[PDB]
Amino acid sequence: MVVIGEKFPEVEVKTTHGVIKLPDYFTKQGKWFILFSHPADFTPVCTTEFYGMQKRVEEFRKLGVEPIGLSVDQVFSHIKWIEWIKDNLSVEIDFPVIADDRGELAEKLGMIPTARAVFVVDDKGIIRAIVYYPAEVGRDWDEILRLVKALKISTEKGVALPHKWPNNELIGDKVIVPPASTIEEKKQREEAKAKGEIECYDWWFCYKKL
Amino acid sequence: MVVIGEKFPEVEVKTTHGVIKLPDYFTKQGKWFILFSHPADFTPVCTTEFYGMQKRVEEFRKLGVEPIGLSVDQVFSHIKWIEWIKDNLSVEIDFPVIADDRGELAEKLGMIPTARAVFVVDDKGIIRAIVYYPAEVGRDWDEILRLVKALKISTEKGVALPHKWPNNELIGDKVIVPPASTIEEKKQREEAKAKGEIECYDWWFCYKKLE
Amino acid sequence: MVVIGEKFPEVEVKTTHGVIKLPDYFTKQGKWFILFSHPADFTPVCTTEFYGMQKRVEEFRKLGVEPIGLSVDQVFSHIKWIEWIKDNLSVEIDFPVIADDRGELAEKLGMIPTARAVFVVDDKGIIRAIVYYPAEVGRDWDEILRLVKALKISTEKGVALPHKWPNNELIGDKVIVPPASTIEEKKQREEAKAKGEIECYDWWFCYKKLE
Amino acid sequence: MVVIGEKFPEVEVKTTHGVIKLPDYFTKQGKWFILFSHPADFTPVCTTEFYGMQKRVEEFRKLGVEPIGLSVDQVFSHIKWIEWIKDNLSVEIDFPVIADDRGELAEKLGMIPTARAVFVVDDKGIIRAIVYYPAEVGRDWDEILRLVKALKISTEKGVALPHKWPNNELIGDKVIVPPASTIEEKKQREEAKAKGEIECYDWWFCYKKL
Amino acid sequence: MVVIGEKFPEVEVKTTHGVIKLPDYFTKQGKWFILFSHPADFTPVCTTEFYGMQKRVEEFRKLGVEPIGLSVDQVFSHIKWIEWIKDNLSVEIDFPVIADDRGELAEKLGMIPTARAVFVVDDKGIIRAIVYYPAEVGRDWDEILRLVKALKISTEKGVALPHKWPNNELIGDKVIVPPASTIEEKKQREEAKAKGEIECYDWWFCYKKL
Amino acid sequence: MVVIGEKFPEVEVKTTHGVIKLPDYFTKQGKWFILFSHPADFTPVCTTEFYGMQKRVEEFRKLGVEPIGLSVDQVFSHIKWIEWIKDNLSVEIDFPVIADDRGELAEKLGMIPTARAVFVVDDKGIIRAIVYYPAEVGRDWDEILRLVKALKISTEKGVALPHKWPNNELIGDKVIVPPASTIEEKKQREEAKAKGEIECYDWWFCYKKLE
């Protein structure tokens, strides 16, 4: 069972796009990845999810984030199920899906306590966020997209993101300055606020434009 | 380290509402709870979260789901921080918040690898879903609301919920029939569909109005 | 790793026909079964095998022998693959197929060293014969049919069956008398032969019409 | 007990043709072998089998496959029993038979849990297929011949063989192209089928002339 | 649990003034420190104590003694509580307070058997005196100031200090000569007293002007 | 090594007043005691301490607190040293002093790391406070007096005492109400204050006249 902050394990996997080495194959191109699991091929909640995912894949890719699925079914069933989606829902799946032949990688990643697990892994191979939904309730990939957006910004810009960013109730798409943690940094906030460089509800709750 | 399906541990916690026994306090009244951790009192992402949560708390409660927060700080900072919320954002927080003294409970639950973890726990004390976000990124309580709406329904109606339900791209707010797992069940789907009882894209992908 | 003579293990399996208990499900009705593994759904040698098997299934059943397949894939691909068989080769598969989730049963039986293994299991739950072919080479169900025909007969009539029976080069469809193992039994063969009750090439090689 | 895919053990055996080292004696000449066991000399089912085998030995040999028997009886009884077959059934056995004096090699190969065991071993000493029939039911060496034919072709040509090849119900003596296992190989099949290089019922079920 | 005469452990701590290394940060400047613990932020007995301490901080500092607090609360609550003291009691706290996140350092120092513990640590990192008061009874920092005064003098001057120095009942602010411990030192006292260099009630109870 | 909250050990000690059992001797009469060690008889800081203590002993006793000294020296030096005190400072010491033969009791209590240790032990045999001063620096019995005054009051009235009580900089000799630890308790503080029952700087900082 892996944990947030941990390195993604070194593993070779078999996919509908060929054998790959994770995390290396993504991390060597400076890319993130979102590894999600799903219970089985030719199941109705999973099929709505692949549809949802394919509709968003290019937004993920434009951020440098590559989605990759995983299920305990062989690659032949994977490919026939992708074809049923093309011929019946008019969408061409083009992200890789792992055929985790005996649940090996799923076991190791604690995807079987296989539920609805999501792992966001950055370009250094570090697990940044983890979701475990049960088999009966489909995910919402808009929230996962929001999360990776935020993850990316907080890394690049040294900032934190408010509840429901970029549509926070109180500050919309403004970002949060990490709370002052010493008497000297409190003074710094107060000066920065006096120069209009930041806005604050208090010395510990400051924010600014993206 | 807890996992989905596992039973929430029996633990006494100190809260802004007093000492309570989890999960019993909630489970004895037939209630679910959403236990969520947050790093510290007097921090800005947490404050926006608390505001978000109080806006939705009555929607959670109408479903029989009680939110309960948790932080490693003592109850007097908890209550002073809540007051700050009232005085500056004029919103009155009225869900309990655990003062997790030395991170004892945070340790048992694996929220100190606290980061922003969420545990959805049903009326039988069973953990139904788990989210771990990092410190820098605030959660979206609308997703957690959506998740428990869906959990309540799948339990009560023996159905499954599509991606992004009740606004699925393909079927909107309809619910999904668990897929046929035998030849006989497949015959049954085809008969039901012929009688207008269900809609199907295939024998394994049938759905219907929630009603 | 199972061997000939050993009793089939007690195991619950999920199939395209539901959950069943092996060997009990078959043994309780006085039936034999032929358990055969195949590598994966949606593969071409397996498909030709499935077609072959469905052509012969009623011949197996007339003998009280039930075929049952097994693969490491979940039951929904099983059933979709069967449908593909119906739609493209217009043959309806109606023998159960086990969905062997993580290769648990495949592991216990040594079919993952799955390759193409066959287990012939009698009405007492005893493994009577075992074939292990590799992935690249499809089986010949006519040989397995011949094998169980011969097994049923040797059990029921206390006889042995010659090479390639019922089309043996030397004696065609006659059956073989177990060879004399004592001086007294040898005298008995010679007396029977003198009375036209058996034919012999020697005292240890006697045979007779199946009747 | 040996297993499919495993190396044949290094062993010296005593035969009606002299002492030999297996698998070496065959593998050094680039030959395969079919090692089969039988319960005893001067038994009726075994005698029908030796007859059947001798009738096919030259077909096996023309493929580079050498048959070798094994039983728990000394070589003197082996030789007298071969003579009874010549004088009574008019056939001259000329494949070696091992005199496995105390069931040693049979024990080691799991031929005694001695039943009716068949081992097909290739020119690299690798067990390619294994049959265990009980003492009461004679084998059919036509099926073993069919198997080695197929084994040989699939090695040489990189192909798979259909149920009952070379007389498959649907495609007769045509061979099967290994199923496409990636989105790129599926495309390749579809192109090859469009050029008449192969025939398919689907992108995963392709076949061609031998 | 530490003990009088023992070295203060090597530890990094997080404070309202930043991360520091104890005892080093004080001992490298040749300074002593008084480490005191308190149960919690925004509590009434602790707040009277911070007030008392701030009123005396400059007297401590003039001796080369730096006060440092410690409590099990994060630095954000520490800073807001210091601000409540400024806005409500008109006093600006300016000694560091440690945010001992999980009671780690408190555990190690036996501050949790967190009670009202005081540790006086000298410029060589040696614990010189230790007080454990329960949560319900506030300390008196005048007595701690008296103690460090005495500690400092006895080190510098090689002397001992009487009950309640510098206002002893019998000798006021005079210091005590360490009792003669041999027949030769007794003689020395008697001679020194005869020269008016010291005053004595007996050869073992001698004292002099500061 | 004893700690605050821990129960004083059962021990027989020889004293200038005879053999006694601690803590029982004091606890059976409902009394507290202040056990304090001192390095040696016939030493000058200790002598000033003894004088200090005898001046205050009757103030300790009026509260039901018995002082008791301890040194590693035998009872005959104890009594001769006390006599020296009477003859030269004309003060009669009348509290017991333990002769701690080989430092046995000093060892158990951690007063030999004796230095100048003080243990305040209540009427239930529980150590309520501990001071360890070094050899060179005499104690201030006025602080120990103040400490037990405060301890007695917090026990009896369920209150807390401010810095330097009964002469606190901010509230003098008023006592402090334990701070509200729940939302409901906070409401109760605000109601009490509105009724003039308590004074507050905030909801968590309320105090009142000792009466």
Swiss-Prot record, chains B, C, F:
Residues 2-153 form the Thioredoxin domain. It catalyses: a hydroperoxide + [thioredoxin]-dithiol = an alcohol + [thioredoxin]-disulfide + H2O. Induction: Up-regulated by exposure to oxygen (at protein level). Optimum pH is 4.8. It holds the Pfam family AhpC-TSA. One of its GO terms (molecular function) is peroxiredoxin activity. The active site is a conserved redox-active cysteine residue, the peroxidatic cysteine (C(P)), which makes the nucleophilic attack on the peroxide substrate. The peroxide oxidizes the C(P)-SH to cysteine sulfenic acid (C(P)-SOH), which then reacts with another cysteine residue, the resolving cysteine (C(R)), to form a disulfide bridge. The disulfide is subsequently reduced by an appropriate electron donor to complete the catalytic cycle. Belongs to the peroxiredoxin family. Prx6 subfamily. This is Peroxiredoxin.
